[PDB]
Protein backbone atom coordinates (compact mmCIF):
# COMPACT_ATOMS: atom_id res chain seq x y z
CA UNK A 1 0.00 0.00 0.00
CA UNK A 2 1.44 3.24 -0.84
CA UNK A 3 4.13 2.95 -3.13
CA UNK A 4 3.51 3.74 -6.83
CA UNK A 5 0.37 4.78 -8.05
CA UNK A 6 1.42 5.23 -11.44
CA UNK A 7 5.01 6.48 -12.27
CA UNK A 8 5.22 10.25 -12.62
CA UNK A 9 2.57 11.72 -10.17
CA UNK A 10 1.69 15.41 -10.01
CA UNK A 11 0.90 14.99 -6.09
CA UNK A 12 3.47 13.84 -5.53
CA UNK A 13 5.48 16.48 -7.18
CA UNK A 14 3.47 19.43 -5.70
CA UNK A 15 4.45 17.36 -2.27
CA UNK A 16 7.93 18.28 -3.51
CA UNK A 17 7.66 21.95 -4.52
CA UNK A 18 6.37 22.88 -1.33
CA UNK A 19 9.47 21.47 0.46
CA UNK A 20 11.44 22.92 -2.66
CA UNK A 21 9.43 26.38 -4.38
CA UNK A 22 12.45 28.40 -4.62
CA UNK A 23 13.27 25.28 -7.17
CA UNK A 24 12.42 25.11 -10.80
CA UNK A 25 9.47 22.88 -11.53
CA UNK A 26 10.69 22.14 -14.88
CA UNK A 27 13.29 20.53 -12.62
CA UNK A 28 11.58 18.75 -10.23
CA UNK A 29 9.61 17.46 -12.56
CA UNK A 30 13.03 16.18 -14.28
CA UNK A 31 13.85 14.46 -11.49
CA UNK A 32 10.62 12.47 -10.48
CA UNK A 33 10.63 11.26 -13.90
CA UNK A 34 13.97 10.67 -13.82
CA UNK A 35 13.33 8.78 -10.46
CA UNK A 36 11.49 6.45 -11.79
CA UNK A 37 8.63 9.05 -10.06
CA UNK A 38 10.15 7.95 -7.11
CA UNK A 39 9.48 11.31 -4.86
CA UNK A 40 11.32 10.44 -2.05
CA UNK A 41 14.45 9.54 -4.48
CA UNK A 42 13.78 12.96 -5.97
CA UNK A 43 13.18 14.51 -2.93
CA UNK A 44 16.77 13.20 -1.99
CA UNK A 45 17.98 14.17 -5.17
CA UNK A 46 17.42 17.52 -5.76
CA UNK A 47 18.59 17.79 -1.64
CA UNK A 48 22.19 17.37 -3.48
CA UNK A 49 21.39 18.07 -6.35
CA UNK A 50 22.62 22.35 -6.50
CA UNK A 51 24.28 24.19 -3.27
CA UNK A 52 22.28 24.63 -0.43
CA UNK A 53 23.34 27.24 2.34
CA UNK A 54 25.55 25.71 4.96
CA UNK A 55 24.79 26.52 8.76
CA UNK A 56 23.14 25.47 11.58
CA UNK A 57 20.29 22.92 11.45
CA UNK A 58 17.51 21.52 13.64
CA UNK A 59 14.30 21.42 12.70
Known sequence: GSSGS????EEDL??????????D???IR???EAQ????????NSLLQMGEE???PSSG
Open 6 to 9: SGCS
Open 53 to 55: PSG
Open 30 to 32: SVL
Open 14 to 23: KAIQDMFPNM
Open 25 to 27: QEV
Open 36 to 43: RGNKDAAI
